[PDB]
Amino acid sequence: ADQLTEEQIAEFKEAFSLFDKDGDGTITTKELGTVMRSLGQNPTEAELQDMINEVDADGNGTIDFPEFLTMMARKMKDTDSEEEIREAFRVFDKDGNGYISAAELRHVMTNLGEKLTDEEVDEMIREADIDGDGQVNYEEFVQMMTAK
Template sequence: LYSIMSTAEQLSEEELALYKAAFGIFDRDSDGSITAAELGSVMRSLGRHPSDAEIKEMINEVDEDDNGSVDLSEFLTLMLRKTSDADAEEEIRETFRVFDRDEDGYLSVKELRHVMSCLGEEVSEVEAVKMLLTAKAKNGGESGSVSNSEELLVSFDEFRALATGQNWP
């Protein structure tokens, strides 16, 4: 009960009501837990579309009693984490939009230097090139050097990989 209360306190009343209702609808046998298949249905009803592997991973993340299913407390914990992940994704997307001054969907050396300068960080062209090359390399793009720094552009996916630490060695 304490676990439900501490998790529930971190959700708005609307979120809590929505998640409890979704849980209740998909707990078809009313045993107080939902299976992996039921969790997939819940997630889709909430506008998310995880793969089967992602659903298994979600269950493993919160399944405190290791029974292979998710009870209400575990479900609320999962929803709290996924909401936080969505917020982080939106924050990264908004940061990218701020950096992408010409709104072409890519960050250039010039744009990166401008934003860093506005943040009080003076970055040389060489440093900006290195930062963008790192972003590309971390997302499976080509690293190395470029003949003209104006040719170097980083996509949102490459920026997100750098910002979240994905694909880091």
């Protein structure tokens, strides 16, 4: 077999729309390197091509829906790491103040393309904030992510 459940796959379908700028269902080296560096890095095209070739079926320089999923489906379906929480935190919070509040979170969601509500973000944070101080720290995040 080579696939994931509606939940696990949920992130994959969505992710695909995050990588590709037009979300046509395929990401090329042009968009790859663009969104890649957009996060906070300055890699090379070489990685984009090589990495992509490792994911694309026809190896034309762009990954497809099943090609991206199948690759990540054959292995590693559900899991996390202390790094995902740190990197994540950096992806969520722009200034990375080691503490994200529902407000800033809402600003982030809508900043990327998500309309979150005050009650939604507030409930999302308070539910992830073990200390309930209005923000989320490392441990609070790592646990709320996997070690709930």
